[model samples]
Target: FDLGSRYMDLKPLGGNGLVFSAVDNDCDKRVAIKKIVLTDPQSVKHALREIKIIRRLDHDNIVKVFEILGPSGSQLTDTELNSVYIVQEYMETDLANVLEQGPLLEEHARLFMYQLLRGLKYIHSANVLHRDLKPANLFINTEDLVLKIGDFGLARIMHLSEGLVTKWYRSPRLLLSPNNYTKAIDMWAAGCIFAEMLTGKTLFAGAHELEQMQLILESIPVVHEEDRQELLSVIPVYIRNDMTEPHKPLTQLLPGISREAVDFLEQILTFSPMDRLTAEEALSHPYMSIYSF
Candidate 1:
């Protein structure tokens, strides 16, 4: 039953070494084909890790890997790069593109995001770190406004001990000490994504490791300078300002935004990962209360 031809057409699907797409010759009108990139060592390892994590996850908001074809590439291929082809259900587009049209009305689009968080909460409960939580990784269904989290290529099974995660959505713990990260790291990125949805742009788009620190210093509180030194080693940036300033309140950026939202975000974006809110707690925070029904 490992028929690969049922998905979409291969040519128009486009091609990229990182990840490729092809038609489900069996497109049977339901399946989507995603070509996995096996050229890079890290990507190959990450892909296998993602396969393990994703197979164990079953949720309305998480994309299921219906089937996998191709090789794990533990053995070398004459073609140079060993790759695998994965078949999954199709999604219309990513949330980032939808938001690019303009800022979202929290009441309408915010609920969808909460559902997204719930999905993430489920993943964390299983002891997995998504590593990447950008809007582009979020997908919309063919029906309603339902959203699902996709692209687990960077995901990994995390223990409270295997701290530190991706730079963009990475929590302070990962920033401060790579070996000292936790599930809270994923929550931090979710909080940022939530805020970005409301503002129609990245809540804290540091752009790079250095700029990330610069933006943090300019807006939020870095707290203890010593605490920050641990975080800075992860990135190449040097903070110029004194870390003495009390944390900048979130209300300062979007005045009209609910206090509950601001408070929740601040906690998740704490200067220390130990203080960052967990995904489940963040789901219950006041800011998300409006959509908590």
Candidate 2:
């Protein structure tokens, strides 16, 4: 609660906003703190929405929100009027950081992903759509190697007409059928996370949402007549001309990959949200069965 007075030095934690920081307050403890330096209407709205989601949700996968320092407190600075400080349990670094250390065996990657989906599965089961689910959001307690998803600043409890979500993890539903939203949106994003674990790189690293959907549809084309025409009309725009037609199918990505794993990935890669596998279904997948624990 009394962080400002204890720390003589502030360590920097890079991200959006000018006040990103971490503090090694000499009280024999390490703490993560964000000092808000600038704010606009959109940033404030996003921050408030994040507060609502984190305060109501409690889970090991999701980041834990500690005390929030607001303007109401006497020790708080008036400079925070347009800004806000979000306090959270300290973490050494994100999965993106640790993953760079080396290629994780399929087993360890599966375990990490299982935990990641466990978190996503819970959030979606509760009807919350985590619009963002990248490596950066996944943090690790380095001392224990425990991973938890953080930074719910872009997440929203999907209701209706929310349009598209974050482009990095955008679902086919959002790209193909903008008005028809569903929890499967989160599942597809989790699928991307799964693919990242396997390849040591982002699966569908498109520059934008439409392109993202194109990359996705390429992996799982819409063959059914009822959907083919609708999808084809947009494919030209979404799929780039420069993208040479893939010579090999999705299975080629991992030659010796178990058919079970490939089938499971295929299920989640469906262009239709209705066809996409639910988190529960994915958890029960045989690809996961290969894992010992």
Candidate 3:
């Protein structure tokens, strides 16, 4: 509550609860501060989880959690369970804002996706799963073209139910799997983002879950009967017959992209999670080798 004494120009950033832009008193430097109200015990636990997880990460593409401001940490009262503030390096825009400007050139997309894969490889190696991987959560600094992944509130060690991912970026297995899925889910979302960067549009912009499923089906080739049965089991009975749709090849869907780019997209967007390339493997793909000059 006394942050104003040490930080100036505090103004709401408007995404997460109590997030704000402020200038540190000593350094006179701008920073983003996320204020997590520790009213609910469970909420506090998750906030602590995010803090612990991010504090362990030390990658260039991963957002830095510089300091923790709360009871006993700084000037906050010892008994103040009221709130905790997280101070982080500020980036003016996120990948979502960059994409809104227009479709990224091939070099830009390649560089950005490669950086993303590097970040993912590091986190996954650390045994972390960024359960919520979306454009909005991916931060960027246009000046040096640096990208950092942020917003770990929904992140988990691993698997969860179907609804965790953003609708358009959700993978096929995530939509159909009753069992626990893997980090491949994040790969799929990254694939969706890569495609969006190339085209300046969401690859599968579905209105609802079912529509999303249908849109996915329409994009990929027809599955084997066994695979079809598995997909059917997860979907509602009424929509079983409604799954029919013409397949569109990646080349057609992602026009103007090179064969290597299309190849990478196919690998990540495959129906089976096991079939998708891991972040480490994705880094080696020829498509990711393209340079931005």
Candidate 1 is scored at a TM of 0.78
- Name the lDDT value of residue 211 in candidate 3: 82
For candidate 1, which ten residues in a row score worst on lDDT?
A: 72-81
lDDT scores in order: 0.67, 0.67, 0.80
lDDT of 1 by residue, 1-293 (tens): 23343444444333454343444443345555566667777676667777678678889889876776665413222233476766676678788787788766767456766887789889888888777788888887635787899988767776332334335666555555556536877777787777777777676566555566656655666677677675545544345443444555566766567766676677877776667777677677776656665
| TM-score on alpha carbons, each prediction | 0.78, 0.80, 0.88
Top candidate on lDDT is 3
Residue-wise lDDT of candidate 3 within 12-32, one digit each (tens)? 875654788888888888999
Tens digits of per-residue lDDT, candidate 2, 78-187, equal 23265566666777788887667755666666777777777877888777877767787888776665778887766788633344444667776676665555778778
RMSD in Å for all candidates: 5.6, 4.7, 3.3
How many residue pairs clash per model? 19, 0, 0
C-alpha RMSD between model 1 and the true structure? 5.6
Model 1 spans > 4 angstroms off: 1-5, 11-27, 37-43, 71-81, 159-167, 179-181, 222-238, 242-249, 289-293
lDDT of 2 at 119: 80
